[PDB]
């Protein structure tokens with residue numbers, strides 16, 4: 001049914017090809033992965049939003065699960081690499097953040113989490129849109145330590161409650177990841193580039209302060225919390241994300257609250273004064 005055009009990427013779970021539907025003529029991204037999973041994933045065919053990469057079809061055959069997605073011409077990680085020398089202009093950053101919070105707000109209203117947001121999962125088009133890829137896949141299959149190609153699954157965007165062993169992730173884990181992504185677009189460097197769970201957690205602690213019962217009630221009771229964690233002081237955001245303005249720094253602070261109950265929701269974030277002058281700029285793309 002599908003003519004492969006080219007290999008475009010490697011997902012957590014399987015290879016992705018650009019492909020053409022042989023009888024509709026449609027160009028699609030075809031994910032090939034080598035049955036609660038099938039039910040859960042089938043449900044995602046109905047979770048449709050303009051900022052969520054469209055799941056067109058789920059095809060289970062021959063010990064393989066094919067997910068047929070809408071095709072987008074570039075990812076944000078590539079966009080960010082391509083703009084390394086002047087950075088993404090702030091208005092486009094704000095537009096992108098605003099549109100991703102809409103995607104989160106939508107899925108979270110339906111109690112679907114992503115749980116593995118990262119630049120690689122943010123795809124863009126020539127219309128100035130940005131969309132979230134792989135929503136719902138982590139609940140269906142888990143998030144493994146390595147991908148199907150053995151590549152290390154990045155920890156850089158992982159919320160602290162996950163690293164401390166909380167088993168019952170809330171929608172707040174996506175807000176944490178998206179705040180790390182926001183900081184990275186602004187500064188052009190990963191905010192917390194951990195290379196192990198403990199290095200990730202100590203990178204967080206060194207910037208935001210080691211958490212305690214004062215900022216995060218119940219934290220000392222979490223499974224992987226140790227009294228022996230070093231006790232680091234918090235730094236000013238002014239130093240973390242220059243030259244983000246006061247509104248942006250205030251929003252980023254609320255997206256990176258330790259306590260998941262206090263972390264801003266996607267819906268409340270949409271109302272933040274940072275978005276008072278939000279516009280939809282069209283980026284420059286080399287296809």
Ligand SMILES: CC(C)c1cnn2c(NCc3ccccc3)cc(NC[C@H]3CCNC[C@@H]3O)nc12
Pocket residue numbers: 008009010011012016018029030031053069070071072073074075120121123133134
């Ligand atoms: C599977 C679906 C989510 C998808 C739609 N467009 N598209 C593009 N397009 C960007 C692109 C186009 C052409 C060449 C390279 C990259 C790349 C890509 N890469 C594999 C992704 C899928 C999601 N997770 C991270 C992986 O890198 N996955 C997708």
